[model samples]
Every structure is written in C-alpha cells, then in structure tokens.
Target: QIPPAYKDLAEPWIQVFGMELVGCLFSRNWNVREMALRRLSHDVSGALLLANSGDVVEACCSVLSMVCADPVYKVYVAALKTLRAMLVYTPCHSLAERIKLQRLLQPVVDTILVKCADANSRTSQLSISTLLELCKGQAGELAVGREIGSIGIGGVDYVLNCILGNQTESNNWQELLGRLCLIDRLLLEFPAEFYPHIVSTEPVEIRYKKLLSLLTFALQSIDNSHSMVGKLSRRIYLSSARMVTTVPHVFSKLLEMLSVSSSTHFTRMRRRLMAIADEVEIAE
Candidate 1:
C-alpha cells in the first residue's frame, strides 16, 4: 500500500530505520540507547531524514542532548558523537523552514559547558571537541559563508551564556583551563560578526567586548595555582588582540590588566605580549 513517492525506501526498512530505531533511543535499557545512538551515527542520510521530519528530530534532539548527562561514560561519548553527526544536515532545516532551528541543536550547549570541567580529562576533551567540530559547520561560520542564522550570532549567545555561567562557577583549575581553551578556539574560528551581527536587521565591537570580558575576568585572578588560567587568558588576549578593533580601548584594558598581574612566572605568553608592543614601537 505504499505510494510511489515512498515505495523506493525498501520494505519496512523505513519503518525500522525511522521508528523502530528511534523508539529504541527512549528505552529504559542503556544497551538499547547506546546501540541506537551508534546506529544513528553510522548512517548520515537516515539521520538527516529523521531530522527533516522535524518533530521527530526535536524529540530526538532532546533525547540526545540530555543523554550527555548520562551516568555512564560510554553512553555520554556516544551522545557527543551522535550530536556531531546531526550537524551535517541541520542547516537545510534553517533554510527551508526559515525558522531558528537551533531548537534542535542548541540544547546540547549547556551539557557541553558543564562537561568541560567534569574533572575527567576524557570527558573534558570530548566536550570541547564537539563544540570545535560544531564551529566548522555552517552554524559556526558566525554569519558568513552559508549564513545559517539558527546557529549564527544567536547561537553564539546560546554558547556564551552557558560558557560564562560555567566560568562564573569555576573554582577548579582543570575546568578553568578547559573553558579557556574553548573560548580561545571560538574567538579564533569565527572572525566574522564576533561582535555584533546587526545584519540586514546591529557595533560589531559590542560582541567582541562581551567575549573579551571573559578573558579579563580570568586574567584578574593571581593565585599561583591559577597560572595556567593566566597563561591561556593572556595568550588569547595577545594572539587575538588585533581582532579587537576597538583600538586603544582594548590595548588600554589589557595594559591595565597585565600591569597589575605579575607575569614573570609565565614568560612564553608574556613574551608574545612584549613582542607585539616591541614590534609596534619600531613601526610607529
């Protein structure tokens, strides 16, 4: 009784692929969920098809994003892997529906933010990696290239909010370092509209200032144990300083922060800061 449009899917393969497999994701049995996640990750087209079905993927998205919080390490990693696979077909959802499809993708950010500092290096590494991978997708372009707004500036806000909250709650150095790495990666990846995306709709500088605040907050700490945080915070400051088109303002802010914070302990980062100023002295 299949219509011609649906006949090519081959017997009940669609039935199992779309429903049977997905329903398994909701099963109370961990084995079934893990198997279902792995199965979904292996088939890009089938995953894409499920996402295209909209409501189904919303439920799918909800299940997968929350699974990152699963007590089992194996299941959490599979959820991360599965989420990354979901990104490939996501942009089209934004294009065709002309809606902020981030609903389907954004839920994962908070879990990732929390995971970034779980005290387990394995977990921290995987969490940041997923976000790093997400940045390369159309959503990560930051507003240029494919320009998928769902994960555009709005999405950046989604990421930053959780990130900022995590940093605010940060006490342990490992999480601090991991979060710092995440921030640096983000600032490095999306050069366009990092500040403001006023677009056809906003000072590009406003966004830059907001993110720079995170670096500034970290740089303010002077605990001997927080040296890694200091090293990373300033590296981001110096390496991407040129990105801060706010001129003497950014320079002044860093100058004040560095002046008060002793850097004799970490010469490498301080060296780069000195090099920039020294290089500028001759040029100007």
Candidate 2:
C-alpha cells in the first residue's frame, strides 16, 4: 500500500477538495478528467496538497502521461496543454519556497516531443508550439540551440533522437510517417548548421554520427513506403543535396553516392547532384 503524503499533508480543507478532484482525474467519465485537469492547472491551492513531498511532482507526471495517452483527441490535447501550464509550477511558490524540480523537467519535455509525432497536424503543432513557448525568456526571445548532444537548450537533442528516444509502451510504428513528415518539415523549418562546439561533456559531433545511423536503420526498416513519405523523402534528399555540398569533403561523397544511387527512386536525385557538381566545378 502507498503511504499518504508526509503522513497527513494538506490542510483538511484543501486535501478534501484535492482528493475528490484527483479521484475524478481517473474516473471513466472523460468530462470529469477534463474538468479535473482544468482545476489542477488553475488552482493555486492545489499546491498545498502537492507540497506534501517531492513525490507529488513524480506522481503528477505519471498520471498526466497516462492521461495524455488516452486515445481520445480532446483528452489528449487537454493533457498536453495541462502539462504545458504546469511547467510553470516548477519549484512552485507554495511548495516550501525552495522545493524546486531539476531533472524532472525532462519528462515534461519528453511528453511534448512524443506528441510532436502525433498523426494529427494540430496535435503536432500544438505540442511543438509548447516546446517553443518554454524556450522564451524574460526578454521574450529564445536562443538558437546546439544541434545535438545530451538534451540542452530546452532539451533539444537531434530532432530524430527526440522522435526515436524511448517509448511510453511496447514497440509501435504509429508515428513512422509522422516522423518523416516532421523530419522533412524541420529540414526547412530549422535554419540549422552543425557547429564544432564541444558539449557539456562529450562533443556534439558524437550524436551527429549517431543521428545519421538512426536514420540509416530507419530507412532500412521502412525501406519501403510511398506517397507522403516519399514526397517528404524527396524533399529531404534535395535539401541535403544542397546543404551537404557546402562542406568540402562532403562534396566528394555527395558526388559518389549520387551516381551510386542509380535506382529508380533516386533517378532524378542523381540529376540534381550532377547538376550542382558541374555548377560548382565551373567556378574553379
């Protein structure tokens, strides 16, 4: 049996309400869950019940993650927005004035990334917008972040790593297409170029290679799929064709791989590669 918070945590007044609200949280009625989430997000008094211990933070996320996994869209979206609002509750003002959460922020960020690959575009954009929103500072501006390494600068790892990281449950391919869409979308959305900066420990390039290998494995696994996936793949291929050539040695392999990929899929890909190669050669 689980112990109650600090052996009688909240003011009786608050605890009574908090208990019923949390009871409704898991009730089968979807509307009750939604209302509970809304109350949890809005009620400052909720902190007193939560302030019982650090585990309050722990239990809350697990519950929200469960809620977010609800197959229903409205419930899932409510959970996403609740997760976003509650982030501001870190080191909550009423929680002891010094009871701040440090590492636990990762899970909150994790929830956002998982939702990024939701099949629904609005779900994806809403989740992404939450991450973007978190990065804002007192000046109302966000910093350009490191390309990859352990999560930093708003827990930004490789865009791919975020998609492929861990899972809420057993293996599934529900987001395979969503991943490619995000990849191709961000290919344009991100104004990114990897830099030589070392990470807080290891170098950033460590994951740069790791990133490519994940994609390589992914390509082999799906080694088949067309339509939107192919359209995104084509854009990705061309995007890389233009971007990679800027690196001197990258140009060498670009030209090699371009011709080597004489398969039907990349038939036109080879044309663009040679087109750029000849154009670049004409300069010297």
TM-score per prediction, in order, is 0.55, 0.60
With candidate 1 superimposed using the best TM-score fit, by how many Å does residue 202's alpha carbon deviate from the native? 14
lDDT of 2: 0.50
Runs in model 1 deviating more than 4 A are: 1-31, 40-52, 91-99, 139-178, 187-213, 216-249, 256-284
**lDDT tens digits, residue span 39-62, model 1:** 876664364555434543455566
Query: What C-alpha lDDT values do all the predictions have?
Result: 0.57, 0.50
Candidate 1 local accuracy as lDDT? 0.57
Count of clashes in candidate 1: 2
Clashes of each: 2, 0
What is candidate 2's TM-score against the reference? 0.60
Report the Cα lDDT for residue 245, model 2.
54
Candidate achieving the largest lDDT: 1
What lDDT score goes with residue 13 in model 1? 38
Q: With candidate 2 superimposed using the best TM-score fit, by how many Å does residue 226's alpha carbon deviate from the native? A: 6.2
